[PDB]
Ligand SMILES: Nc1ncnc2c1ncn2[C@@H]1O[C@H](COP(=O)(O)OP(=O)(O)O)[C@@H](O)[C@H]1O
Ligand SMILES: Nc1ncnc2c1ncn2[C@@H]1O[C@H](COP(=O)(O)OP(=O)(O)O)[C@@H](O)[C@H]1O
Ligand SMILES: NC(=O)CC[C@H](N)C(=O)O
Ligand SMILES: NC(=O)CC[C@H](N)C(=O)O
Ligand SMILES: NCCC[C@H](N)C(=O)O
Ligand SMILES: NCCC[C@H](N)C(=O)O
Ligand SMILES: [Cl-]
């Protein structure tokens with residue numbers, strides 16, 4: 021039962037309703053690294069950059085392999101940091117390490133000295149059967165011995181996206197957080213991150229379209245960044261609707277969305293519009309226990325009415341890119357993927 | 363000291379803050395009309411029919427008006443005419459009289475009859491070329507309209523529009539807003555070949571700072587919400603960029619117009635006030651209804667006045683303002699002599 025408390029007043033609130041205390045790394049890029057250690061060397065299985073930031077459980081995050089935004093430099097740091105930890109803990113077989121990158125700085129989230137849920141993904145993207153190799157390693161065959169020494173960076177992009185069970189429990193707020201709730205995953209393969217992301221998205225049963233009206237209702241910390249997102253969408257032919265505060269900031273950057281009322285504001289409001297099919301896409305980011313609680317209708321509504329929605333700006337940007345891709349254009353077999361590897 | 367109460371809750375509100383009290387039904391969304399005439403007991407001469415720009419509810423003394431009428435139908439004017447004639451005799455008018463009417467849903471309501479010379483007489487004299495005070499003085503003294511040879515109503519070939527000037531800038535603590543009470547100190551006159559030109563001249567004469575470019579702030583009430591769309595449309599066609607407050611922006615977006623959203627003061631920064639003060643606006647159309655809303659919207663009008671931005675507090679006025687945008691007050695001048703010479 022992990023929560024993110026914003027302030028002091030916010031803690032009692034928890035405390036009461038409600039121990040490990042940790043500083044939340046806000047606006048950070050979460051990373052998952054899968055590796056093998058035989059006591060002799062460390063094999064980097066895959067470095068995966070999640071789309072959703074730290075604070076959204078890795079299990080519920082879409083992710084990319086290779087990393088789509090992280091610097092070689094930043095990643096080399098991680099690589100070294102994992103090797104250091106492999107030896108230190110005396111890993112023999114599989115291991116997974118979770119990082120957060122904030123302001124060009126690498127921080128340690130956790131070390132899982134065992135097989136992690138991303139293994140099959142990495143194995144498929146990299147064509148290397150990590151569970152088999154690590155098994156052998158555990159049984160006594162060194163990496164050296166196996167001819168498995170080099171880290172594989174495929175020529176193509178591999179993206180993993182999850183599927184969430186919210187539709188099965190309507191009374192639940194379909195919102196991402198530090199706790200994992202997904203049931204499954206899909207893989208998208210493309211020549212570009214945008215292609216891979218498009219394939220992941222469509223495979224995950226997303227109802228996203230390449231036309232219509234998008235609803236933008238983001239929080240403070242996203243208002244600035246949301247400008248670029250609106251630009252993108254307008255550029256893809258989307259019309260824009262926005263809730264008061266968000267419209268304000270857009271307006272201040274030269275973008276004039278059509279305003280929509282919050283439910284308490286009047287009619288029609290967001291719910292009538294969602295219900296009435298005015299939107300093909302919704303971006304709704306929130307912060308604060310309170311805020312979340314009051315915005316619940318947007319998310320429940322979008323779910324109920326099958327409108328594609330993103331609860332993170334990063335997801336938004338990923339979706340925006342995918343719009344320039346065509347998930348049906350080309351196909352490729354796993355064998356083909358694998359042969360293409362140096 | 364009178365106002366328009368909108369409901370029971372409001373009546374208390376008032377009745378408290380304030381002796382038999384008069385209670386009249388307020389004809390909302392009505393066109394106010396002024397009619398000046400002369401009766402000699404044998405006949406009735408119509409001096410002029412003026413159509414106010416601001417609706418009934420904005421005192422006639424403070425309304426802009428036009429001679430001849432700019433929206434009313436002849437049919438409706440003919441009623442007013444018969445009505446004036448009937449009143450004239452019944453009342454035994456001998457000399458000048460003035461009749462004020464409200465038109466709503468194609469129906470003519472009587473607001474008041476003033477059986478003496480009215481403040482609009484000079485304007486009508488000047489527009490029609492007929493010196494009403496002289497004519498009526500001769501009538502009171504014994505010379506009939508027939509004896510005088512002044513028996514037929516004169517409809518000029520040009521439009522004449524009267525605009526007023528208000529003293530709000532002399533008393534900054536007052537809310538420079540129109541209502542049932544007259545607060546104006548003077549009037550101007552504008553003459554044109556079209557109502558738009560007459561209006562532009564009257565507007566310019568009245569010391570208006572209106573411009574034909576920039577950004578306009580739109581913040582109107584409920585009853586105006588639907589109709590303000592076409593005005594924002596006229597404003598965009600003229601080249602202006604629009605700003606709007608919450609609910610106004612909502613109505614407009616649904617009509618396809620997307621103004622830039624601005625925050626009220628309680629709402630956030632920068633707000634309407636900050637914007638006005640920084641010279642962001644060149645035009646402001648701001649309509650309100652009910653004691654509270656009025657009280658609450660105060661800052662817009664005071665700021666507008668303070669910062670010299672032209673502002674309209676009525677939609678009818680806003681529309682007048684927009685039409686004038688299509689006219690050039692400085693393009694042509696005409697002398698009164700010439701004007702009267704045109705008279706047929
Ligand atoms: N200090 C932190 N700052 C930001 N996000 C964090 C932090 N600690 C954990 N998280 C988020 O919570 C998720 C779960 O954290 P983790 O420690 O790995 O728990 P679990 O045992 O469920 O794996 C992480 O994947 C990340 O999204
Ligand atoms: N029943 C009414 N409906 C609408 N407006 C009215 C009504 N009665 C008065 N008014 C408005 O108030 C103004 C002042 O009212 P009026 O009766 O003419 O008083 P005054 O003697 O001060 O001129 C009118 O010019 C008109 O705009
Ligand atoms: N950032 C948000 O989701 C805003 C809150 C929400 N729209 C409400 O009605 O309270
Ligand atoms: N019609 C209006 O002017 C609405 C009221 C005003 N904007 C306020 O700040 O309350
Ligand atoms: N990877 C999580 C699912 C994404 C979902 N559309 C959301 O942003 O909430
Ligand atoms: N005719 C009265 C003056 C109009 C002023 N601009 C206002 O509309 O408040
Ligand atoms: Cl795991």
Ligand SMILES: [Cl-]
Pocket residue numbers: 476479480481482
């Ligand atoms: Cl008078």
Ligand SMILES: [Cl-]
Pocket residue numbers: 532533534535536
């Ligand atoms: Cl004062």
Ligand SMILES: [K+]
Pocket residue numbers: 050070071072073074075076077078081
């Ligand atoms: K994450």
Ligand SMILES: [K+]
Pocket residue numbers: 394414415416417418419420421422425
């Ligand atoms: K009037």
Ligand SMILES: [K+]
Pocket residue numbers: 474475476477
């Ligand atoms: K009277």
Ligand SMILES: [Mn+2]
Pocket residue numbers: 078118130
């Ligand atoms: Mn974890």
Ligand SMILES: [Mn+2]
Pocket residue numbers: 130132
């Ligand atoms: Mn764990």
Ligand SMILES: [Mn+2]
Pocket residue numbers: 422462474
């Ligand atoms: Mn009167």
Ligand SMILES: [Mn+2]
Pocket residue numbers: 474476
């Ligand atoms: Mn009177």
